[PDB]
Amino acid sequence: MYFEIYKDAKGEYRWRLKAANHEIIAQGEGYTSKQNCQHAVDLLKSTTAATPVKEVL
Amino acid sequence: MYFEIYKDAKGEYRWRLKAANHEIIAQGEGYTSKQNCQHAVDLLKSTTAATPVKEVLE
């Protein structure tokens, strides 16, 4: 399991989590600068199993 | 900091990471089932700072 940061064809930065077999497990959304994208990833990984999951009803 | 799962106009399910001042940090992707969306979130939160981050670039 590892994260992967790249630049798409349109011209924006994005991320995606790959499995052991290099299989895509989750896709992220676009960003302006590479800096902002990297900050988002660090926040996601600083997330614990105690982070609440809420649904809008 | 918390995750939020909701539905758009296309009928797809998606998530987002909100912060204190109701500020969106990260955005999900379209999902065809509330079940699949919840599984993605659990996998994301099961990652730690030890999880490797590989970045490619021009």
mmCIF file of C-alpha atoms in Angstrom:
data_model
loop_
_atom_site.group_PDB
_atom_site.id
_atom_site.type_symbol
_atom_site.label_atom_id
_atom_site.label_comp_id
_atom_site.label_asym_id
_atom_site.label_seq_id
_atom_site.Cartn_x
_atom_site.Cartn_y
_atom_site.Cartn_z
ATOM 1 C CA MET A 1 0.000 0.000 0.000
ATOM 2 C CA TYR A 2 1.464 3.397 -1.091
ATOM 3 C CA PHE A 3 0.435 6.862 -2.298
ATOM 4 C CA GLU A 4 1.401 8.190 -5.730
ATOM 5 C CA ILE A 5 1.554 11.871 -6.785
ATOM 6 C CA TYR A 6 1.555 12.822 -10.485
ATOM 7 C CA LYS A 7 0.541 15.428 -13.070
ATOM 8 C CA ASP A 8 -2.351 14.533 -15.421
ATOM 9 C CA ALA A 9 -2.850 15.468 -19.103
ATOM 10 C CA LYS A 10 -4.954 18.574 -18.386
ATOM 11 C CA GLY A 11 -2.216 20.159 -16.331
ATOM 12 C CA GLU A 12 -3.096 19.680 -12.636
ATOM 13 C CA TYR A 13 -1.640 17.763 -9.671
ATOM 14 C CA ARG A 14 -3.324 14.715 -8.204
ATOM 15 C CA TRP A 15 -2.940 11.609 -6.041
ATOM 16 C CA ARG A 16 -4.004 7.941 -5.911
ATOM 17 C CA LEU A 17 -3.519 5.033 -3.453
ATOM 18 C CA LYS A 18 -2.106 1.831 -4.953
ATOM 19 C CA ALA A 19 -2.261 -1.670 -3.472
ATOM 20 C CA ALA A 20 0.530 -4.248 -3.168
ATOM 21 C CA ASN A 21 0.073 -5.330 -6.814
ATOM 22 C CA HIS A 22 0.219 -1.732 -8.057
ATOM 23 C CA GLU A 23 -3.609 -1.813 -8.218
ATOM 24 C CA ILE A 24 -5.548 1.455 -7.912
ATOM 25 C CA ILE A 25 -7.583 1.557 -4.684
ATOM 26 C CA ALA A 26 -8.640 5.198 -4.654
ATOM 27 C CA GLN A 27 -8.452 8.294 -6.871
ATOM 28 C CA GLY A 28 -8.132 11.865 -5.678
ATOM 29 C CA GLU A 29 -9.138 15.203 -7.173
ATOM 30 C CA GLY A 30 -7.202 18.034 -8.792
ATOM 31 C CA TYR A 31 -5.044 20.755 -7.342
ATOM 32 C CA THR A 32 -3.391 24.014 -8.319
ATOM 33 C CA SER A 33 0.233 23.771 -7.126
ATOM 34 C CA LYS A 34 2.263 20.654 -6.252
ATOM 35 C CA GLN A 35 2.682 22.068 -2.765
ATOM 36 C CA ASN A 36 -1.018 22.062 -1.971
ATOM 37 C CA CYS A 37 -1.382 18.493 -3.211
ATOM 38 C CA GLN A 38 1.382 17.225 -0.994
ATOM 39 C CA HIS A 39 -0.144 18.936 2.055
ATOM 40 C CA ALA A 40 -3.491 17.212 1.445
ATOM 41 C CA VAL A 41 -1.806 13.796 1.341
ATOM 42 C CA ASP A 42 0.031 14.388 4.622
ATOM 43 C CA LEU A 43 -3.251 15.321 6.315
ATOM 44 C CA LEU A 44 -4.971 12.178 5.000
ATOM 45 C CA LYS A 45 -2.216 9.938 6.307
ATOM 46 C CA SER A 46 -2.202 11.704 9.690
ATOM 47 C CA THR A 47 -5.820 10.505 9.963
ATOM 48 C CA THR A 48 -6.443 7.736 12.501
ATOM 49 C CA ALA A 49 -9.066 5.000 13.030
ATOM 50 C CA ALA A 50 -10.595 7.404 15.555
ATOM 51 C CA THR A 51 -11.495 9.933 12.806
ATOM 52 C CA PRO A 52 -15.350 10.130 12.699
ATOM 53 C CA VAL A 53 -17.325 9.125 9.543
ATOM 54 C CA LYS A 54 -20.539 11.125 9.065
ATOM 55 C CA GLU A 55 -23.348 10.884 6.520
ATOM 56 C CA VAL A 56 -25.499 13.844 5.386
ATOM 57 C CA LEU A 57 -29.164 12.845 5.514
ATOM 58 C CA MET B 1 -11.173 16.814 11.277
ATOM 59 C CA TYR B 2 -13.753 14.329 9.928
ATOM 60 C CA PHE B 3 -14.912 12.507 6.793
ATOM 61 C CA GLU B 4 -18.270 13.217 5.155
ATOM 62 C CA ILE B 5 -20.179 10.903 2.761
ATOM 63 C CA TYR B 6 -22.945 12.314 0.532
ATOM 64 C CA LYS B 7 -24.789 11.972 -2.791
ATOM 65 C CA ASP B 8 -24.648 14.322 -5.838
ATOM 66 C CA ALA B 9 -27.217 14.924 -8.643
ATOM 67 C CA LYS B 10 -25.875 12.074 -10.788
ATOM 68 C CA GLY B 11 -26.810 9.563 -8.080
ATOM 69 C CA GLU B 12 -23.168 8.781 -7.295
ATOM 70 C CA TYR B 13 -21.724 8.610 -3.771
ATOM 71 C CA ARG B 14 -18.652 10.625 -2.736
ATOM 72 C CA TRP B 15 -16.610 11.784 0.241
ATOM 73 C CA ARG B 16 -14.616 14.717 1.518
ATOM 74 C CA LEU B 17 -12.318 15.623 4.388
ATOM 75 C CA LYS B 18 -13.535 18.649 6.295
ATOM 76 C CA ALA B 19 -11.504 20.688 8.777
ATOM 77 C CA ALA B 20 -12.414 22.970 11.678
ATOM 78 C CA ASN B 21 -13.597 26.061 9.777
ATOM 79 C CA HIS B 22 -15.710 23.829 7.490
ATOM 80 C CA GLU B 23 -12.806 23.903 4.965
ATOM 81 C CA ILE B 24 -12.510 21.142 2.367
ATOM 82 C CA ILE B 25 -9.053 19.508 2.497
ATOM 83 C CA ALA B 26 -9.493 16.476 0.205
ATOM 84 C CA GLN B 27 -12.142 15.307 -2.274
ATOM 85 C CA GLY B 28 -13.337 11.851 -3.249
ATOM 86 C CA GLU B 29 -14.397 10.411 -6.585
ATOM 87 C CA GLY B 30 -17.670 9.134 -7.970
ATOM 88 C CA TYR B 31 -18.859 5.847 -6.428
ATOM 89 C CA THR B 32 -21.676 3.539 -7.578
ATOM 90 C CA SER B 33 -22.615 2.364 -4.068
ATOM 91 C CA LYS B 34 -22.623 3.769 -0.591
ATOM 92 C CA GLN B 35 -20.870 0.561 0.387
ATOM 93 C CA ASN B 36 -17.922 1.045 -1.954
ATOM 94 C CA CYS B 37 -17.473 4.640 -0.793
ATOM 95 C CA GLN B 38 -17.305 3.677 2.855
ATOM 96 C CA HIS B 39 -14.698 0.985 2.109
ATOM 97 C CA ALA B 40 -12.442 3.519 0.384
ATOM 98 C CA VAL B 41 -12.599 5.824 3.413
ATOM 99 C CA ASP B 42 -11.682 2.997 5.805
ATOM 100 C CA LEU B 43 -8.634 2.145 3.681
ATOM 101 C CA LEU B 44 -7.493 5.791 3.627
ATOM 102 C CA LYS B 45 -7.702 6.091 7.381
ATOM 103 C CA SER B 46 -5.884 2.785 7.854
ATOM 104 C CA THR B 47 -2.784 4.462 6.457
ATOM 105 C CA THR B 48 -0.123 5.948 8.738
ATOM 106 C CA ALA B 49 2.766 8.406 8.283
ATOM 107 C CA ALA B 50 4.895 5.322 7.619
ATOM 108 C CA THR B 51 2.942 4.700 4.404
ATOM 109 C CA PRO B 52 5.232 5.503 1.447
ATOM 110 C CA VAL B 53 4.536 8.494 -0.822
ATOM 111 C CA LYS B 54 5.995 8.233 -4.378
ATOM 112 C CA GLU B 55 5.768 11.372 -6.579
ATOM 113 C CA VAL B 56 6.477 11.540 -10.339
ATOM 114 C CA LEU B 57 6.971 14.730 -12.260
ATOM 115 C CA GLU B 58 8.216 16.410 -15.455
#
